[PDB]
Amino acid sequence: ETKCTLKSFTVEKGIYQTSNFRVQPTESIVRFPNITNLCPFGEVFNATRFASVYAWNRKRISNCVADYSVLYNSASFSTFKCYGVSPTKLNDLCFTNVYADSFVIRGDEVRQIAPGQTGKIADYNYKLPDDFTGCVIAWNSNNLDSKVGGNYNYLYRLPLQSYGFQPTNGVGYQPYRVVVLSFELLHAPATVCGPKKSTNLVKNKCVNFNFNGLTGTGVLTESNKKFLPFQQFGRDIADTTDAVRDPQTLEILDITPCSFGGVSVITPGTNTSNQVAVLYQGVNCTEVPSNVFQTRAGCLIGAEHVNNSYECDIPIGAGICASYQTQSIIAYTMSLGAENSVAYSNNSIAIPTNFTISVTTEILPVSMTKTSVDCTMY
Amino acid sequence: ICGDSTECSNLLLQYGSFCTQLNRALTGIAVEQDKNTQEVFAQVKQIYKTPPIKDFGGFNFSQILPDPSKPSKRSFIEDLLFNKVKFNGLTVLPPLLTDEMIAQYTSALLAGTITSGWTFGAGAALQIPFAMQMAYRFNGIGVTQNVLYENQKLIANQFNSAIGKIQDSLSALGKLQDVVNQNAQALNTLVKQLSSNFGAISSVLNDILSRLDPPEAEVQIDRLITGRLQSLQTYVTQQLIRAAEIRASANLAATKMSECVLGQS
Amino acid sequence: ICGDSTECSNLLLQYGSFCTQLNRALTGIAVEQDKNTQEVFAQVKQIYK
Amino acid sequence: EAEVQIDRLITGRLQSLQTYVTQQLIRAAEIRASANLAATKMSECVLGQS
Amino acid sequence: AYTNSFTRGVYYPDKVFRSSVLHSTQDLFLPFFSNVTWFHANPVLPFNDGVYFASTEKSNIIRGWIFGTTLDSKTQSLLIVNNATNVVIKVCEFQFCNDPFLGVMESEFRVYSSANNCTFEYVSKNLREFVFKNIDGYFKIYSKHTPINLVRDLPQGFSALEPLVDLPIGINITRFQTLLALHRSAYYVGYLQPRTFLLKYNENGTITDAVDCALDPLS
Ligand SMILES: *[C@@H]1O[C@H](CO)[C@@H](O[C@@H]2O[C@H](CO)[C@@H](O)[C@H](O)[C@H]2NC(C)=O)[C@H](O)[C@H]1NC(C)=O
Ligand SMILES: *[C@@H]1O[C@H](CO)[C@@H](O[C@@H]2O[C@H](CO)[C@@H](O)[C@H](O)[C@H]2NC(C)=O)[C@H](O)[C@H]1NC(C)=O
Ligand SMILES: *[C@@H]1O[C@H](CO)[C@@H](O[C@@H]2O[C@H](CO)[C@@H](O)[C@H](O)[C@H]2NC(C)=O)[C@H](O)[C@H]1NC(C)=O
Ligand SMILES: *[C@@H]1O[C@H](CO)[C@@H](O[C@@H]2O[C@H](CO)[C@@H](O)[C@H](O)[C@H]2NC(C)=O)[C@H](O)[C@H]1NC(C)=O
Ligand SMILES: *[C@@H]1O[C@H](CO)[C@@H](O)[C@H](O)[C@H]1NC(C)=O
Ligand SMILES: *[C@@H]1O[C@H](CO)[C@@H](O)[C@H](O)[C@H]1NC(C)=O
Ligand SMILES: *[C@@H]1O[C@H](CO)[C@@H](O)[C@H](O)[C@H]1NC(C)=O
Ligand SMILES: *[C@@H]1O[C@H](CO)[C@@H](O)[C@H](O)[C@H]1NC(C)=O
Ligand SMILES: *[C@@H]1O[C@H](CO)[C@@H](O)[C@H](O)[C@H]1NC(C)=O
Ligand SMILES: *[C@@H]1O[C@H](CO)[C@@H](O)[C@H](O)[C@H]1NC(C)=O
Ligand SMILES: *[C@@H]1O[C@H](CO)[C@@H](O)[C@H](O)[C@H]1NC(C)=O
Ligand SMILES: *[C@@H]1O[C@H](CO)[C@@H](O)[C@H](O)[C@H]1NC(C)=O
């Protein structure tokens, strides 16, 4: 990896940043709030007496928690068509108002409750607009609405005629109860919509979290701060979310950025050896994936720590250097220098008796290369 | 730039080596900061020690010699001076030298001067009594050296009072606070620049991504990328200009340590 | 950039603190210029005649 | 249509050329100080005794 | 009469905890040292952009407000009431008395004479401040109850107002009123403008001081 980073086949001694170490997060915990008013449909879908077809009812469902799944999967409905929107995506959308219309018709008149039909029912009893949005639900109700001798209380406009329902009628002449849900979206600020589940909430693990809208990543930890009892999450200076409140249990939890840091490779040079040591920079050495050694500069793997102190060879940091000495690599604290002890006294002097002539070099750059570019040709 | 997302990384891969250049630029700066300190402080061969007595001709250096009752072993005035001064890919590396090591270099430079005058800066340290070294220095400014020996007590008292006034004048360092302030303030702007759309619908790479489909989202993500890359270039260019100013200052410090501490100017 | 135009000014707000940075850079080098000539010429305590 | 695609290249290449020209100014200001020190050492160590 | 607020009508701009952080905001506030009407005991006022509203007593003469554009039928309006029982928010089309009130036997409520088409219901000395605003079909209400050591004059001091309610109505508003309990056996009105403030946050996360950044050169 070092040879690839440098684009060469011979690396000279040094220390090279080669890549990065990033812990990985597993599972996605989706937190959310409970559900009180889940809407009691069990009044429109559970009535003891429905409404005529020529004077249908009209209930205006309003701000609530609507669960169209208990409807969709109830398997008791003989007809469940959705027009503006396919059924499974109802528990994931929000509108302004839902209206529910209720009535009772024959069995083979359920095909006129649809956008763009004709017939005595859709012509003048109950007409659906041509860009309908809701869903139409219908189920047979022979045992409730049909009575021996004929139930002449269910009329329709044709001016009014009455279905004489009787229990010995072939299907398609037995009474069906119909409910038409119509979702509308005026121009308000919001209203009723599907539900919201909430997985479990762990701690002390890099995780991918969602707190009723707040999407993030990190380790969650028990807090000891105290919000005011209307504040949801806390922010830092420079404006990053660093605390949240759990909606269900209402406790404050800190959000720490998941560990991370550069990876460096320490090599004595390929002309000496092919052994290598690895520094994970400012990462705690317990969360890296022999010699594992913790430094103020990160976690070092592949070098042994000795107690001697030499002159610095390859600089690691915070006073630590490495060398290829003791057929391998090692760590330690660099040496400032020898130790000279001047025999100072209040009446002692040292005077030299000889000298040496020494000559040293000093190298300095004075120029660099003069280059020109031609903007247009480049 | 991207930050976690994966739709961002493939789009940013289209810009070439813009990010490799910036990391090289910042790494050069960080390697230069250790050489600055090596050039100012590691100007001594041996680690010299003062003798256990303190018979220096009436001169008293106790406020600037190291304090043996401390983990850091700093001096009194070095203790006064030290009480007056994770994110989205950002990291702070530690210096190679601890400041225990720096205090240990400075105390050795001090013991070299108090015990050998200027001889340890040109070769091996040759001891000389402190009053006689003070008399050599009076010759260097053109005063005759009996003026020192006949006024030794007065001269030592004046030194001692002037050293005492420095702590009171201390317990100034705005030149050291400015560097810290300018750097922290330039690092705060880079983080604040991440909540700007730069003319996209939003400034958070998920909400753009979970409210549009790819052909539509790539357009906004490229605007976000362009803004965030411009911010990082501004940051790195200013760090390059600000490090060349710190280097010219450490060069002046090295010359002062050579010429005012290891000799008489 | 905009020159007395509110349509342009609100669009310029979508880039953040670029203009604050630019003014801060230009002001710091106007302060340095007075320091430059204080350091060369005011090297004397009294006005001698 | 090719205008929109040529402009994307023009912007990138201009950015890259201007980055090259900034980093050369910053590197030349450093070579200049080294040559200024070399000129002082030639005066003070070669034509004198310091 | 008219009076001078000093530093009044500061509310928490939103959730999100916070501590010692001179945080800067742009929002609709009541400017410092403003010209607030004085009323004694009342008439139809405007709304036009939010409202500050304080009141002082030991009894309870102030018994809620009524809002809207026409304060009658043919268009919808809000109604917020409090008998000696508890608060009653309500949103219908009404027919409001041009001088609506409630008595104090203790029989009352000559307020309206119509409650049609209701689209929202709800049922269940002293200084009582309120901030009313109406944005994107939501009608927000902040409030605070401080105890004065006077009876009925506007005091001086700092006290931030905490959010109370949120109603997704959709209603248009251009006018509002007040409701009082008659005799049978003092209040102010500020308005809000888009200002920029600097709020000082405590270590518990409460706003303890503020700066209005358009008062004077020092600010
Ligand atoms: C109307 O109410 C009845 C009774 O509460 C509900 O019938 C239940 O349906 C579930 C699922 O089919 C059965 O497991 C229960 O046994 C039924 N109840 C009883 C008492 O046996 C019905 O679901 C309600 N209708 C709607 C639309 O919610
Ligand atoms: C949301 O619902 C859960 C249960 O579904 C509530 O958990 C209860 O919390 C109380 C603590 O006051 C415990 O005594 C109960 O035993 C818990 N119930 C269960 C089933 O664990 C939770 O309190 C609800 N959220 C809020 C905000 O009240
Ligand atoms: C001063 O030092 C020089 C060495 O630099 C001494 O000269 C050396 O003497 C030894 C022994 O006589 C010879 O082996 C070397 O060849 C000499 N060196 C050179 C360069 O000629 C010299 O003797 C010393 N003087 C005193 C007085 O000690
Ligand atoms: C060197 O000077 C220090 C003063 O900075 C002397 O220490 C103080 O001495 C006085 C009395 O002379 C005491 O009252 C103080 O409490 C001392 N301060 C300390 C010990 O921190 C010190 O004695 C002088 N050295 C010598 C050898 O006289
Ligand atoms: C590099 O290799 C050459 C020949 O293999 C050898 O002479 C030289 O000593 C090597 N350098 C080091 C530093 O080992
Ligand atoms: C790494 O984590 C362990 C477990 O909490 C802790 O004991 C250790 O101190 C951490 N590393 C450092 C350098 O503090
Ligand atoms: C280094 O010396 C210390 C002395 O405190 C000792 O505890 C430690 O075991 C030594 N390390 C090794 C590797 O021998
Ligand atoms: C408030 O405005 C009215 C408008 O005429 C003015 O008469 C009154 O003096 C003002 N009050 C204050 C305190 O400025
Ligand atoms: C208080 O007023 C509301 C307004 O409708 C009413 O519903 C409630 O019944 C009243 N309280 C009592 C005790 O009647
Ligand atoms: C509102 O009330 C009026 C009169 O009671 C009525 O004509 C109108 O239909 C109602 N609004 C709706 C949406 O039904
Ligand atoms: C409020 O009144 C304005 C009058 O200009 C009107 O245009 C607007 O549609 C009304 N609000 C709603 C939600 O209809
Ligand atoms: C609230 O703040 C006060 C003073 O700032 C502090 O003493 C107290 O501990 C904090 N927390 C409380 C009262 O719960």
Author numbering:
A (entry chain A): 298 to 455, 491 to 621, 640 to 676, 690 to 741
B (entry chain B): 742 to 826, 854 to 939, 944 to 1037
C (entry chain C): 742 to 790
D (entry chain A): 988 to 1037
E (entry chain B): 27 to 67, 81 to 143, 153 to 172, 187 to 247, 264 to 297
Sentences from the study reporting this entry:
The spike (S) protein on the surface of SARS-CoV-2 exploits angiotensin-converting enzyme 2 (ACE2) as cellular receptor and mediates the fusion of the viral and the host cell membrane during infection. The activation of the S protein requires the receptor-binding domain (RBD) binding to the peptidase domain (PD) of ACE2 and the cleavage by host proteases into the N-terminal S1 subunit and the C-terminal S2 subunit. Here we report the cryo-electron microscopy (cryo-EM) structures of trimeric extracellular domain of the S protein (hereinafter referred to as S) at multiple states and conformations, including the all RBD-locked, activated, S1/S2 trypsin-cleaved, PD of ACE2-bound, and the full-length ACE2-bound states.
Additionally, we solved the structures of the S(p), S(D614G), and the trypsin-digested S(D614G) (hereinafter referred to as S(p, D614G)) proteins with overall resolutions of 3.2 Å, 3.1 Å and 3.3 Å, respectively, which all exhibit one RBD “up” conformation and show no obvious difference. To our surprise, S(p, D614G) shows more digested bands, which means that the D614G mutation might increase the flexibility of the S protein. It is also reported that the D614G mutation can change the conformation of the S protein to accommodate more PDs of ACE2.13 Taken together, the D614G mutation might increase the flexibility of the S protein and make it easier to be digested by host protease, which might contribute to the increased infectivity.
